[PDB]
Amino acid sequence: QHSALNARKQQATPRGVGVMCQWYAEKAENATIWDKEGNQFIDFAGGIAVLNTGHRHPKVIAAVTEQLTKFTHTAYQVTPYESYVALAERINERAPIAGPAKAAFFTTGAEAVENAVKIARCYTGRHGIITFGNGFHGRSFMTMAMTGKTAPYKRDFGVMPAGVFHARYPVPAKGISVDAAIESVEDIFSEDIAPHDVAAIVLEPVQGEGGFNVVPAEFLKRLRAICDKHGILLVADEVQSGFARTGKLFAMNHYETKADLITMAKSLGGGFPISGVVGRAEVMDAPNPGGLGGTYAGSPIAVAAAHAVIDAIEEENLCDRANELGAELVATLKDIQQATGDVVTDIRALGSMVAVELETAEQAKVVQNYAMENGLLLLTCGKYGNVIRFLYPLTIPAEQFRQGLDILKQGFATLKA
Template sequence: MQSNAALQNRRMAAIPRGLANAFPVYPQRAENAEIWDIEGKRYIDFAGGIAVLNTGHRHPKVMAAVAAQLERFTHTAFQILPYEPYVELCEKLNALAPFKAPAKSLLLSTGAEAVENAVKIARAATGRPGVIAFSGGFHGRTTLTMALTGKVAPYKVKFGVAPPAIYHLPFPASSHGVSVSDTLKALETLFRADISPSDVAAIIIEPVQGEGGFLPAPTELLQTLRKTCDTHGIVLIADEVQTGFARTGKMFGIEHSGVEPDLVTVAKSLAGGFPLSGVIGRASIMDAAEPGGLGGTYAGSPVACAAALAVLDVIAGEGLLQRADIIGDEIRKSLQNIANNKNAVPIAAIRGPGAMIAFDILDRQGAPDAAATKRVIASALDEGLVLLSCGIHGNTIRVLNPLTISDAVLAEGLAKLEKALVAAHIE
């Protein structure tokens, strides 16, 4: 029988260390919210492949749609021979777009690719170079998206100077001592000192920061950014790569604010584990690029499009928007009980819309405790629970279980989480 240790040795010899792994655990199979490794150990999945599996591992409807497409064809390149699944998916995404104007969509392969193309489209539409992003934000690992990402380690270390015309504002969060007023003052300073608003193509923001710590963007900030973009002809991009497709209790996270973006980047849970991303935007902006300026050899794979069409059917048919709120309430209630357990690691700031939940681990003085966070995650793995951390201090634990998880498995996972928080406690 294969072992995790043996495979990890092979992995270390064959793959560069720059590609890190959270755990030396190798899955053999998975169903919905459960994973079994090659040694037969069972895990409950509270990571979801980093928010990719809102519809769970191997949802039967997704697998059936993929199997049917595999019987037809796997690739033609949409730019050469277009196909109906791409067209149908774009029609459905356009109908779901979180703005009233007519929409068009572009399909790609990865979240970073979606962000890059959104910036390209914004620059084409405005004829301007500048892009404003936020500290703590995560937009990808390519050269451009790495520059947009508001965190140096590990994403920018050793990779040189960022491309020009990229600027960052502090993201407002009380835990970081930054208010909306502070952010808006920084924007005014940026416009006075570094770049005129007439040279800014786009402002990009996550409705809820993902890697930054599951921090919701305040509605006041989003409203002001919308007004600023309208005043100066700037494109507002909502990066919904992690927040999209029912995770927050809405199809898109920005819908909680009532603010309408111009472009929306999507990926992760769009296709139930198959690589697919996209840009949904106002048709007048999306048509700014010249023919041939957008696309990619594998962009909008027909297999992934078939999966995504099934995912949208599952979200609607199984009521996953409502299910996200129900799951989120259950997780919050459980975490509040754990917060009162004196035998557990101290936790605070339970937050997030829908089922996009996170909390912070602190020391006895109330300071961020990254070391305790690592102990909790290791203890959880021992218990058979896959957890992820995030946040600028490395002390935030995020919960990203599939929205299709059963009540029983959710309760079991939350019990394992409490055991891990107790096991990691040091007096």
């Protein structure tokens, strides 16, 4: 057990940080995690979509090791470094942005979303922000307000910032059509905030915490046309979907519609804190000097890591692997859906952004608990906690991926057993 440690944890730290695993990490590499006892876990969490290149990817660690011989922190706004500019250049070349792009780096995912909103507010001269129910954008007061889920993220913290409103995300399998979703945005214009007061509409192309809901292309196209008609900026939040998760570098790369601004974090850094925003030059250039920045933003350590993340994604063909592993997991879920009765209600996938929705959260906890007992680390998500989402490193060895898929099948088999 870890129970002296958990006693220490409960004495020394607040209860408000929920902690899922009862065991403590001692070492991790690629898609394997060891506890203090040497028990091994196959990792289908990825630190919540942060390790698309795996724990301690060798080229990421080499890059960080080399940067530790140079410097770890100067504060970019005091003394800049070339690697930050180069990383911006590499992202500008790769991002789906219309016309010349520019990029800046911050530290956290919430900061990237919040600075995209700052940039959009200042470019448009407007305050309003429209997001979607079940969207997840951060734990800041502004990003909590944008977040479309009150429990547990914001119910403790009182009044939220004005001018943030939630529309319906298109989920046709749950009877929310593209029409209904567009109509809910229009109701916000008619009821809550005039279109010329809305600075940005912000959405995840694949909703992450909200349950791995993939946006229909038709919804993006009609949303783009609405934003173009009213001068509103369109923001794709790719904090969770970016860096090869969906089988292309950015989820937006699957669509013809382009966003004006795109946010990035998590596996950008391959396990080190960094985030960023890339977007149309003219939009990014709206804030005045001193208007953007941050102490830790663009950390030299995490910039060295991110350069190696891009290298690895392209050198190891990890977009392709994301599609290959995704399809294999989807086939296993369809067979579970057949082998079971009254359990699987939906299978959603784009690349290796894959989830299975179960009728009941109790069912999903049975599977998650069994997996944990048997050396497989699984995350749930969703409004009702009945979704298992799959976030294994895209570098996971195929034979170990199969072992995980087998344990998953075993966990489901215990439900009617």
